[PDB]
Paper text:
Here we report seven high-resolution cryo-EM structures of filamentous peptide nanotubes based on a cross-α supramolecular architecture that provide insight into the designability of helical peptide filaments. A structural interaction is identified based on an appropriately placed pair of arginine residues (RxxxR) within the corresponding peptide sequences. This local interaction motif, designated as an arginine clasp, is robust within the context of these cross-α assemblies and can guide the coalescence of helical protofilaments into structurally defined cross-α nanotubes. In contrast to most structurally characterized filaments based on synthetic α-helical coiled-coils, the chain axes of the helical protomers are oriented in a plane nearly perpendicular to the long axis of the assembly.
Numbering used by the authors:
A (entry chain tA), B (entry chain jA), C (entry chain ZA), D (entry chain PA), E (entry chain FA), F (entry chain 5), ...: 1101 to 1129
L (entry chain a), M (entry chain f), N (entry chain p), O (entry chain k), P (entry chain u), Q (entry chain 4), ...: 1001 to 1029
Y (entry chain 6), Z (entry chain w), AA (entry chain GA), AB (entry chain m), AC (entry chain QA), AD (entry chain c): 2001 to 2029
AE (entry chain O), AF (entry chain M), AG (entry chain K), AH (entry chain I), AI (entry chain G), AJ (entry chain E), ...: 1 to 29
AR (entry chain HA): 2101 to 2129
AS (entry chain XA), AT (entry chain NA), AU (entry chain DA), AV (entry chain 3), AW (entry chain t), AX (entry chain j), ...: 101 to 129
Write the structure that this text describes.
């Protein structure tokens, strides 16, 4: 099941990356 | 049933990959 | 009934493959 | 009734095969 | 009534065969 | 009434045979 | 009323025979 | 009224006979 | 009124006879 | 599971960054 | 887990900054 | 009593429907 | 009483329908 | 009373329909 | 009793439906 | 008893549906 | 018993649905 | 027993749903 | 036993849902 | 056993939900 | 075992919720 | 084990809540 | 372990509450 | 450890309460 | 007082209803 | 006062209804 | 007093209902 | 005041209705 | 006193109901 | 004021209706 | 102060209630 | 301040209620 | 601020209510 | 910001309501 | 962004409402 | 993106509404 | 993609609406 | 693919609408 | 395939619509 | 197959429409 | 088979339409 | 069989249409 | 049988149509 | 009002007399 | 905002004046 | 926004003036 | 956006001016 | 998008100017 | 797509200019 | 597809130019 | 199919050019 | 079938060329 | 049948060639 938890970690990292990009571009705004 | 769990892991990895690509391209945007 | 579960595993693997191909091509996009 | 379940297994295998072929050709696309 | 169930099994086998042929020819496509 | 059920079994067998022939000829196609 | 049910059985047998002949000739086709 | 039901039985037997003859001749076809 | 019902029985018997003769001659055909 | 906690830390850092950018721009307002 | 607590500290600092900016602008009002 | 004669009329109309459909058959041939 | 004679009229009209359909048959031949 | 004579008229019209249909028969022959 | 004769009428109308559909078949050929 | 004859009528109407659908098939070809 | 014949009618209607859907398929091609 | 035949009817209706959906697929292409 | 066949019917309806959704996909493209 | 097949049906319905949501995605784009 | 497959179904429904919410996002943009 | 997969489902539903709220944000802007 | 993943789910739901309240803020402005 | 993450969740819910009350303030103005 | 006159009107309408029903009777004869 | 005059109008309409029903009676004779 | 006149109106309407039902009887004969 | 004149108009229309029904009576004789 | 007259009206309505049900009986025959 | 004149018009139309019905009467004689 | 204005609104609504009840009186007369 | 403006709106709606009730009075006269 | 503008809208709608009620008055006269 | 524009739209619709009610006034005169 | 454009559309529709109401005014004069 | 284009279409339709209302004005003059 | 093309079609239809309304203007002058 | 071609057809019909409206303009001048 | 050919036919009809509208233009000049 | 030939016929009729519209153009010049 | 021959007839009529339209062209020149 | 011969007749009439249109062409030149 | 002979007559008339059109051709040259 | 009560008492007595006469007649029948 | 309250005072004074004049003239009545 | 409130004050003053003039002239009436 | 609010202020001032002029002239009336 | 808002401001200013001119001339009236 | 928005801005500016010119000339009127 | 959007931009620019020229000449008028 | 889209782009460019030339010459007018 | 699509592309290119030449010559006009 | 489609392709190519030549010569014009 550890694979499922790794997948969750990946999903959350990706979401954090989306949020960070949105933050940076909104700062550019 | 472990095969089902492996399939779930695969699905989530693929979704994470989609999200990562979308994040990178939105950063390129 | 294990055959049914194997069939489910196959279906999910195929769906994951579709998603992975779509992800790769969207990255190419 | 086990024959019915075998038939279901066959149907799902065939559907999985259709999906796999569609996935491969979409990757070729 | 078991004859009815056998008939159902036959019908589903035939449908699975149709689907398998369609899958193979679509792969040939 | 069992005669009615036998007739139903016959009908379904015949339909399955039609479907099997159509499947085989579509495979020949 | 059992005569009516016997008549129904006869009708369905005849229809099944028609279908079987059509199936065989379509296989010959 | 049983005479009416007997008449109905006769009608259906005759129709079944017509259908059987048509089936046999279509098989001869 | 039973006479009316007897007349109906007669009519249906006659119609069945017509149909039976037509069936036999079509079989002769 | 520590990976999950790291992901949470990342998410919260990103949210804090969004909030800080919004604060700075509202100060600019 | 200390990372989570640091993230909380960051969030609260950002909120305090928002509030301070709102206070200053309301004083300007 | 009127309802009884009404039912008789319905019987006769049904027989008329039989004959009319048979005529349509014979014309179609 | 009028309803009774009305029902009689309906009977006679039904018989007329019988005869008319029979005429249409004979014409079609 | 008028309704009663109306019903009588309907009876007679129905008989007229009988005769007219019979005439149409005889003409068709 | 009227209900019984009504049911008989329904039987006959159903047989008429059979014949009419068969005619439509034969026309379609 | 009327319910029994009603059920018979339903059987016959169902057979009519079978034949009519088969006709529609043959027309579509 | 009426319920049993009702169930038979349902079976036949279901078979009719099968045939009608198959016709719709063939038309769509 | 009626419940058993009802269940059979449900099976057949489900198969009809399969075929109808497949037809809708083929039309959409 | 009826419950078992009911469950089978549910399986088949679910497969129908799969196919119908796939059709809706293909139409949307 | 019926519960097991019920659970299988639930699995398949869930997969259908996946596909339907994906279709809605693709339409929204 | 049924509970295990039920849990799997819940997992899949949750993934469906993810996809549906993502679609709603994309529509809102 | 079922409880573990249930917990996983809860995790995924929570992530869905995150995404849905974010969508509501973006719509409100 | 299930309790740990439950706690994680609670964390994520709390973050969702944060985002939803922020959305409500932005709407109110 | 679960208690610790529970406490973290409580912290985050409290922050959510802060934001929600602030929104209610801003609406009231 | 308007209420009283309304009541009188209702009385008269009721008497009219009496006469109308009497006409119905007389016609039915 | 308009209410009173409306009530008078209703009285008169009721009397007219009486006369009309009386005409119905007289015609029916 | 209006209540009393209303009650009288109800009496008369009831008598009218009696006559109307009697007409129903007489017609049914 | 317009309401009062409307009421007068209604009175007159009612009287006209009286006369018209009287004409109906007289013609019926 | 209005209550008493209302009760009388109810008596009469009940008698009317008796007659109406009797008509139902007589028609059913 | 237009309402008042409309009411006058309605009065006059009502009087015209009176005269027209009177003409109907006189012709009927 | 908003409370005071709300109280004034309540006063006015109460006056409206008075006036409307007086209207209902005048209509009832 | 929005509360104050809402209170003003309530005042005006109450005045409207007064005026409309006065209208209903004047109509009723 | 949106709340303030909504309050203004409510003020204006209330004025419209006043004006429309005055219209209804003037019509009623 | 969309909320603000929606509020503006509401303002304008309210003005339209005012103007339309004034139209209805002027027509009523 | 689509929300913003929808808001603009609403603004324009509101202006159209204003203009159309002004038209209706001018016609009414 | 389709949503954005739909929004543009709505903008244009709103402009058309403006223009058509202006037409109706000019006609009314 | 079909959705995108449909959106384009809507754009063009909206332009047509604009142009036609302008035509109606020019005619009205 | 048929959907795509239908979309193209819609595009062309929209262009035709544009052109026809321009024709109507030019005629109106 | 018939669907595809129908789509082609629609394309051609749309082109015809374009051309005919252009004709109508040229005539109008 | 008849459907396919009908589709071909539609193609040809569409071409005829094109050609006829071109004729109408050339005449209009 | 008659359907197929009818389809052929339609093909030929369409060709005739083409040819006749070409004639009309050539005349128009 | 009459249907088949009618279809042949239609074929021949279509050929005649072709030939006559060719005649009209040749005349027009 | 008369139908068959009528069909033959139609065949011959169609041939006559062919021949006459050929005559008209030859005259036109 | 007691006069009204005596009147309806007379009415019911007369109706009872009619019923008794019809009863004695049907007894003589 | 005190100006709004003064306006309300004016409105209520004017309404009171209307009511006082109406009272005076109704006293004169 | 105070300008909007001043505008509302103006509107209400004007409406009060209209009402005062109407009151004065109704007193003159 | 303040420009929009100024425009609204202008619109309301203009409407107030229209109302004031109408009030003045109605006073002159 | 600010350009769109400026355009709206312009439109509303122009409409206000139209209204002001109409008010001025109606004052001149 | 910003080009489309600029085009819309242009259209609205032009419409505002038309309205301003119409306002100016109506002032000259 | 961006070419289509550029074409739309061109069309709207041209329409805006037409409108601007019409506005200029109407100002010259 | 991209060729079709390019063709549409060409058509729209040409139409825009026609419109631009017409605008230029109407400016020259 | 791609040949058909290429033919359509050719047709549309040719039509675009016609339109471009017409635009050029109308510019020369 | 592919031969028929090739023939259609040829026809459309030829028509496109005619149109291209006509466009070229109209450019020469």
């Amino acid at each position: 099941q550890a694979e499922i938890l790794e997948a969750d970690a990946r999903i959350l990292r990706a979401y954090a990356e989306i949020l960070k990009a949105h933050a940076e571009i909104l700062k550019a705004q």
